[PDB]
């Protein structure tokens, strides 16, 4: 039924001695892997606790060992058997008693579901509980389960370790697999939650393995095909049992995989040679996490020394002896004493945990005893009355070294901290085909990257980033999809990227560079005489300089002879100065200064044109008045109209400021690499047209009076010469207006107007001086 | 200890017989108001259940009555006593037994905490529970408490009824008050949650009343001052006990309140005379919600007929007898038999609930027994093995009539539906000063609005809306603040409200209306001859029409006499037609047609103006050529230049399309109510200037020719007449430009330019008409 050990203070114990069988009977056959090994461990702990004078020197400690049969309902009935001893008041019945048996704590509930039940029924009666094999993450809410403590870390720490290895090694795609039950699902659920909470990682696959059958071998193909749908995902994490992973590896081998994606194992994978067989090539490179294992020396010596006639407190030892050696009292066994010789048994990894659990209880009880009373040699009555939340507080704040090297402690929640060591499988080049240690995880991940290569490869050989990092000079961040990985699209070539996250538009009037770092147009467009067509006008201007160097030559000496006296001296000075004025104007407009000095050039063509025609205007009137019927008088009237032209540009300056702007923008989207720039001063089509039209207005009033001049027998050569010039001048002016209309639609017209205007002035001036100088050469050759 | 009743099937019972006292002893004195009345009710129910052949005919029903002492820890020790009888297996001890007592259900846990605790310990063992006095809303989660049922509705239904009355009667501002414990806080929390879930209501105040002392009378002044801060909130809901509300009403009375805000009571307020004393004026109009009460006739007869020698099963009856009459075995009592005479006792309102609870349990067992086995007369063995979720399912699906008229049922959650009746206090017009019924609440609110009139006024007199309706013709919705109640602001005056929630800008070119419903401008601006200054030009045009009827009068007969022959005949016809053409132009431009007929008008001033000067042009040339040294030739040269004017409008037709637009926009923000509009065809400043400027060229040439013509000894009066007219027109043409520029900045110039143009055309013609008149009067006089 239950083992009873006498003592003034006792603690209970739940262990799965038997195993559940058919639906009818709660439990049938016995189990040796976890049934008797753990009981003997607890009994051994109590024996040496009572022997040790360091802990509880003057007070003894007892216990009540008991079994659960691995059933929730059976656990509840038994847990009530602890507490009824103190809760029952009395019984009004007689047959024709026993000590109260006050318990102080309970140690057990190895499973998960039985722990949840026992925690729920003992939370009400305020009795502390310490578990040793309950790894489910559900028993982690302090509010939900007040009185509960664990010496074994849950799966949440294991999931944290995996995501730390994935994060540190560098990966973005991970595929999760899980088996049936409450282990695989809770593992991946924690893994997903931590990844979402920490950020930077994502889940791309999530397949579930049912347990309706094991001899199908089709669902395995379904999942492996599902995992192969995206070749980029090369890392998978597994939470299944050993049989499942054995099947998956077999499927991968028979499928002749070409990607050979990496695995990440859980505690079920661990370090065991049984699962791997003929799959050593495909299982290579699998990172597995396993809890640290320690072997004690005291328990083994104790357990190997017990026999039937030595100890009788244990009620299930005889049945275990019968089942272990397979002999019943048709084979009989008497005094074999070969438990450690006939059977090659090895202690489990959880024996160290139950020994630590008993210790933590004994230490907290020991501190509570010392703090409550110190003036009493034995057991003070204050201890019996005090119990409940006080002992739980002492259990949380405990710190010591157990049977293993590592210490034991409890954090805020109440579970022991996680300590794992990472393993890896290497066979293609390693001296030993077995697993090799590569790192540990206690509080921060400590992993030797250079220690793992698994042959013919660097430690960072595999890549899984969901997108190749795009840095060819263009980048942009798109919100579409999961925030895990980013997609980059080529933005327009007319602007550069800002903060490596967006393509903002750069300020105008300048092209972007090639590497998309700055937006500036170094190249510019400038007018040149040699390269563009401006050479021909330049040659024409040079030719005009030669012409005026010959007209004015025969003027210095020929100033008093009675040959030039026929022409008026005052009129001769006007034409001499007018011819030189236009020669300087064409040279000025040809040149393109950057500074705002064109103001002195615009008057050369605006005001310099009037004085050229002024002498011709008064000359026509002078030769016509003598036909219809004071040289200083003709000088005055011409001087007056010069002032009109001079005042014309002055009032223009008062109308609007003479601001000079050299900046220009092409604003062409056809060729973003092209950058056309033009600089001009006071460039207005109306300004140049109206200023030039002033001469045309007075030329009309002069030509009309010249119709009657033709045929006068005064100077036949001179009269015929003037009439020839008039028709030529009207020709160039009549052709000038059509030019700018219907042609400014393009972008290269900024330099063509200047050239055509240049040759127009030279052509109009050459014809004027040609007829004027025609009679002058007669006195030279003749 | 506990009352035990024999039976093959039994159910347990928890009742608070005693009350907790000092810290040492768990419970001390007994309570009569809830201790013994409820037990005797349950015992009576069991007796008549066993007597009634309708339910469980061949099978009896027993029970185990037991007390809880109103302690959480004590309730646990008792619950274990129920469950141990069936869960315990055996006990290995001897002294030198009792019936198994299999329970099937439990009825009890009156309080709130003990119900939560008992529900927690029995949920694990899967034993159904029915409570009768647990009204807390926490016991309403089916997931948290599987095996739990209630015959008394929780407080959530009460909070729903209040918010339904506030919503139905129409209010928006409410203030919440609550007391200490787990009743007031949970009540208002539910009220707040339902208000937010249903919507349309808000909480403006939330004050909390501690319970550290009872003789301070200061905290009440603080809260009433807090509640008086906003005069708008005239409705408060209270969840406190009777002592608290008695103090608040006293505080309101001594504060001489002027707002007299309304109250809404809870179940604690109910319908009692204790809560009202000298405050009848200020408590008037308090809507209170109370559960329906019914009185049974069987229990009273049973309880009044029991005596010490009659019944012995009850173990606490003797102590109750001693405490009820206050006599101990220094006053002794023997055989009084005046329980119903010496004490004026009345049964509680919860007795009907325990009787319903016992019934629901009996019916569910009756159905389960009938459904499970029907071929056996007695108790079939299947019933003992069957238990757990099945009986719970049969308890949920039950429906019958209990001791009261109303039936009992359980909804999806497991708590009985709420059924209340609404009360109100009235003491001015009603003959009866007491409370009067005004409505009921079972599934939908049924309230008689016309039946309640508080404050000696109309029913719906008080309102609390946070704001007036604010519908003066325009409104805007503001998101600031709580969505419950809103603030309205006046938007700009130039647009109307859209969907009664926003002020969008209506299309321009018109004005909005006054009620903010439409955006259209009916009024328009049209030129009139009578009202504006256009009368004077109109009268001038009429004067010219009369004047021209005199020049042509002496022209038909005087065509062959040798007096008029001095003037050119062809010239006379030209000037005769020119005068009549201008007379028609001034009339056409005066009129403003809306139709597309202005094209025939513009030619009157475009082409009809040149023909007026055409005769004048050739007249001056004709008299000048004879001075420098063929009537048909003069006719041809004038006829040609008319064609140029005729072609002038032709090229204008092909240059731009004659699009006519009558719409106009003032775009003035100074007067939003003003709407100015002008309709004109082809309104361009340059068009009228250039068309009129063409005639200036020819007139200028005539002016210079006439100036040189002066002094010729050919005509005396005619030469003097033509000299003066050439000097008069230049003045008005020179002044036309100054008034044209720098004047159009306003908005009323659309019609002032026409008037001045009309007069200008008339006066420019009268000077010519007067010049022709002088020769006419001369020949008449001569």
Author numbering:
A (entry chain A), B (entry chain B): 41 to 136, 144 to 376, 387 to 686, 698 to 850
Any passages from the paper?
We look first at the metabotropic glutamate receptor mGluR7, a class C GPCR important for synaptic transmission and neuronal development in the central nervous system. mGluR7 forms a functional dimer with extracellular domains (ECDs) responsible for ligand binding and dimerization (the ECDs in the dimer are disulfide bridged), transmembrane domains (TMDs) that mediate coupling to G-proteins, and short intracellular domains (ICDs) that are largely unstructured. Dimers of mGluR7 have been shown to form immobile clusters at presynaptic sites in neurons and the ECDs have been implicated in this behavior. Thus, the ECD of mGluR7 has been shown to be important for cluster formation in cells. But molecular details of mGluR7 assembly are not known.
To address the mechanisms of assembly, we purified native membrane vesicles (NMVs) derived from cells expressing excess mGluR7. NMVs were generated using N-ethylmaleimide (NEM)/Ca2+ and those containing mGluR7 were enriched using affinity chromatography. mGluR7 clearly forms bulk phase clusters in the NMVs at these high concentrations. Selected proteins within the clusters permit calculation of a cryo-EM density map of an mGluR7 dimer. Using the single molecule translations and angles from image analysis and map refinement to position dimers in the raw images, neighboring pairs of mGluR dimers can be seen to contact each other mainly through the large extracellular ligand binding domains. The contact sites appear multiple, instead of being dominated by a particular pair of surfaces of the ligand binding domains. Micrographs with side views of the mGluR7 bulk phase clusters show strong protein density on the intracellular side of the NMV that does not appear in the final cryo-EM reconstruction of an mGluR7 dimer. While mGluR7 dimers contain only a small number of amino acids on the intracellular side, it is possible that other proteins from the cytoplasm—purified along with the NMVs—could mediate cluster formation. The mGluR7 dimer has twofold symmetry, and the contacts are made through ordered structures on the protein. However, in contrast to HCN1, there appear to be many competing contact surfaces in mGluR7 rather than a dominant favorable surface. Consequently, clusters of mGluR7 are not arrayed with the kind of regularity observed for HCN1.
